[PDB]
Design a binder for this molecule. Structure first.
Ligand code: AU1
Ligand code: MG
Ligand code: MG
Lengths: 594, 596
């Protein structure tokens, strides 16, 4: 038995060594992270999962490569609607057309809290439902014990919001997040660093961090970086830049490979505390343009084009960005392409694409009344700030809009109205302060050889549409003339109303597609793309390559998260190990214990 | 025109980029580091060079791999002699044999400072001479601007010093180091963390850090370590242990392997927990034990005393020494030995030169460590030293006139085992070893053992193997084979001393050849016997070393050794590796902490 009992001695000795190992090693645990996207059109939850690691005498940290989106939630009320509804009730209806004493609105702070509460309860219910459905029991125990950091950030929707209203709303939003329902057991918590409005530049920087993280271009490890003989860490692969065109604004972000004019303000990632010191350094141009988003540029373009006598004659506005055979009521109201081929224009003021701009452009807004600069920017886009809201949004002496399907005239107008206007488009003090009045100035003062990624649903639909009809090659790499010739052909299509409804009939029997509420004005976006590509092509430095991407595939061939600012905002916080440990784990949800 | 000016534009753009580069990059600078070895036989300087790097917003640090010894200086007086000389003058002569009121010695602190000053001025002169001779003008500018950290550490020589004397001396030594001659421009400086006595365990730990650093076994980068799936950093190669036999003590150091079973009485050191290495370095549990009286000089004195007080060896005034060659004869004393050109051995009569002085000085009834502790008195009496007798009779080998060599290796091993390796009671001044759970060398491998490879170091330890290799008695690839070593040494140690015209010679028994008889090899057979005994004890351990190597030096990246084996590199590393603390003490406070 001295070989049998000997194996028993080694079992007992192993039991002690295993136990000793368990008390010396690092332990992994699952954490949930929540990003609330408070956008122009809606407020939506984004539920993420990440792997945390705790080591004896080293604390706890997140493995940044483990960050994965589990679900993007339902589209609830935007913050603009919350504030505008509260103003309708407490400042009275048509406060957009009258002087409002903002001081008097302070007596209605509890009522603003009640409005904000309604939205917060829906978002909490949505977040909890996603968590309950995706996690198993063991995962829920970990997720519930660690605490759930919440980052609610607002973008272009309330970026141009007047007076003190928005910032008071943020104080209320944080209080609501810090008091979740005790019933579900999920410990949601926030602070003024996680929950706040983000600037257009930050928004762009965060989307740049997301892109480079997911594509594996950004990293501090030997796989993604290299330390030279002088101790400087360089990224192994070029960091790529990003163009993101959303609903309300467009972000242009690129790392510099440089010597800049004194007027241009570039961001150093380390110096500006976006990335920790251990990460490769980069000087990045990040500029955001209000009125360049899909919805906001649609409203502005109609208003400016249909007020020019070259386009407006005897009640008819001739729109070169719209198809031949397409007709709509002369308004910036939301368009619904109906099954019968008709274009239904929504007359509800809240649904009009000019509402945000016409609301900003008011003589009762201190930004207009005290600043001639801002008034002239408004008047340059045919908005008279002295007139009531209804006439500010109205396209005067215009009954009907008719499409002419003339792509070059469309490009020409997109260039003069949106890309290279005489004055900066309104609510762009931030872009102007960084040295850029308009899109045309971006590539004139700063250019880079850094590759570029073009993002945004509409930007992608523009290329994918031309690819589907075999008008563009599947390997399209940004060729301007190739894009202009493809779009010139597609945009000269006739709109035919058939039994099966409105159809885009391509010239040269090249086929067809259905006309709908998302693609009826896609030609304006193709014109924006062409104009943008020409401006990038004119820069002293030209991108090494240009790519259009819907998503970035993870290590298993499947994307781990979406493109956008959400992953970036998480990384911006979690990468600063010490600060994150103190705020997420030391203080944590227990900071709220009352 | 446009092609040529575009290039001219590119020269201007380059001029700016070169300067942007300079103000963004890390910059390298040379620093000198000084380790003063305050050992048992002497106090000697060790001048090192290291590359420092300063990075914007990261401060300054030393590249540990750049540490190189430029020179080990002259052997000046040991701290023991400084203190005993001071006692001779202020407590009076023969204070070793009389009661001394230690309280009264406080009035002589300035005089202790004056004695210490004499030694410090010699060491400073030696250090400055080494620096002036090795550095060029650009190197001197860097070395002079950065400041020169000094680490004076005392070992076995003053480890057992009585009363408060030694610690008062350290306060004076630091003050002297912090006030260098302004003339030479080298800005030497120290503090109580760098300049202090070091325990035998620390001494062993530092020699272990040196060995593993130089051999590239110890490291924190992907080349020398690996991080597992659970975030634990392991060394890529096995960390090796060390046996170091110096002049006064011997250190035994080894890392403990996975699932090691330790009795509660055995105290192993965790490198990170005990702050020897920073957290970023692989963790290890290390047995480090030091034995006083196991050094070359101290064991020579003790061995003679014990062997020649034994009736099996002492008869008719002749002590028969089996550790000494046939035909070798000396005066019966532990006094320093000189092999003269005529073949005669002259034993030095000077009490300060007698190898028993440190032990006989410790073993006194007027030392509170003996008078209050029967334990210590019994340890002394077990080595034939009566602490009640004057110094002269404590050092004397009674009724013994002549020591004659018998060249009997097995009798030599037998005696080294009973006297030195496995004595009845622990050898005196070993409370530190005893406190860590080890009374003697024989207990080290009984209580703890490891599969960790072992390196055998020390001047005598290497001479023992190299001598047998030279006479082709041992193979060049000797890996520690006990019977092979005993067989080789038995043959070599049975050699006869022949007195020739060109001086005395060691004649090998079977025309195997010969070598010159000198003051360094006359008693080498005791060290061979110590080696054999040590190897048998390691071979008896539950876990045996993967391999045993005898090394004089460790080769650097260019085939040439960067530094010596020993505690010196280790003590530097122990401080420089803690980046933040080193930056604060060496650079933020620096030599300017001393500014008037
Ligand atoms: N298939 C499609 N074709 C063209 N445009 C499309 C599309 N799907 C969405 N879009 C456009 O993206 C925008 C969606 O807005 P978001 O990306 O949510 N930006 P924000 O609300 O956070 O500010 C809409 O304005 C819509 O016009
Ligand atoms: Mg958005
Ligand atoms: Mg020594």
């Amino acid at each position: 038995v001295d070989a049998d009992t000997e194996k028993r001695i080694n079992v007992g000795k192993t039991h002690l060594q295993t136990l000793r190992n368990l008390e010396t090693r690092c332990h992994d645990s699952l954490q949930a992270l929540v990003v609330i996207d408070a956008g122009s059109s809606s407020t939506r939850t984004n539920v993420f999962l990440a792997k945390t690691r705790s080591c004896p005498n080293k604390g706890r940290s997140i493995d940044p490569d483990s960050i994965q989106l589990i679900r993007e939630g339902k589209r609830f009320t935007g913050l603009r609607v919350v504030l505008e509804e509260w103003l309708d009730t407490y400042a009275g209806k048509d406060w957009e057309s009258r002087p409002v004493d903002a001081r008097l609105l302070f007596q209605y702070v509890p009522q603003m809290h009640e409005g904000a509460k309604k939205l917060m309860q829906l978002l909490e219910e949505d977040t909890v439902a996603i968590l309950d459905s995706q996690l198993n029991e063991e995962q829920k125990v970990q997720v519930k014990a660690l605490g759930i950091p919440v980052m609610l950030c607002s973008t272009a929707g309330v970026r141009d919001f007047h007076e003190w209203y928005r910032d008071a709303l943020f104080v209320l939003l944080r209080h609501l997040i810090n008091n979740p329902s005790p019933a579900h057991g999920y410990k949601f918590f926030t602070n003024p660093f996680w929950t706040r409005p983000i600037t257009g530049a930050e928004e762009g920087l965060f989307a740049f961090i997301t892109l480079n993280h997911l594509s594996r271009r950004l990293g501090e490890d030997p796989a993604r970086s290299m330390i030279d003989e002088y101790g400087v860490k360089h990224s192994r692969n070029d960091l790529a830049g990003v163009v993101e065109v959303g609903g309300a604004s467009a972000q242009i972000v690129f790392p510099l490979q440089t010597v800049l004019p004194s007027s241009v303000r570039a961001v150093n990632l380390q110096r500006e505390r976006l990335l920790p010191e251990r990460y490769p350094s980069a000087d990045v141009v990040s500029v955001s343009f209000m009125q360049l988003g899909m919805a906001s540029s649609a409203g502005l373009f109609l208003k400016e084009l249909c007020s020019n006598d070259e386009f407006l004659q005897g009640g008819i506005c001739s729109n070169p960005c719209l198809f031949k055979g397409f007709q709509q009521s002369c308004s910036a109201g939301e368009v619904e392409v109906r099954p019968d081929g008709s274009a239904s224009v929504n007359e509800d003021v809240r649904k009009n694409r000019l509402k945000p701009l016409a609301t900003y452009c008011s003589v009762h807004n201190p930004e207009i009344s005290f600043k001639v600069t801002n008034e002239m920017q408004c008047r340059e886009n045919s908005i008279d700030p002295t007139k009531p809201l209804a006439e500010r949004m109205k396209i005067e002496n215009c009954s009907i809009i008719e499409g002419t399907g003339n792509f070059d005239k469309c490009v020409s107008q997109v260039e003069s109205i949106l890309v290279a206007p005489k004055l900066p488009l309104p609510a762009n003090i931030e872009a102007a302060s960084s040295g850029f009045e308009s899109v045309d100035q971006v590539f004139r003062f700063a250019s880079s050889t850094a590759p570029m990624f073009i993002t945004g649903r509409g930007m992608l639909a523009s290329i994918d549409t031309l690819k589907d009809h075999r008008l563009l090659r599947s390997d399209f790499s940004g060729d301007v003339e190739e894009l202009a010739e493809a779009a010139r052909e597609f945009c000269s299509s006739e709109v035919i109303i058939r039994t099966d409804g409105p159809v885009i009939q391509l010239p040269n029997a090249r086929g067809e597609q259905k006309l709908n509420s998302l693609n009826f004005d896609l030609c304006k976006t193709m014109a924006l793309t062409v104009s943008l590509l020409r401006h990038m092509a004119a820069g002293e430095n030209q991108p090494s390559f240009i790519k259009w991407e819907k998503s970035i595939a993870g290590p298993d061939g499947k994307p781990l998260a979406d493109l956008g600012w959400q992953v970036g905002v998480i990384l911006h916080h979690v990468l600063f190990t010490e600060e994150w440990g103190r705020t997420a784990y030391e203080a944590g949800y227990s900071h709220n214990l009352e």
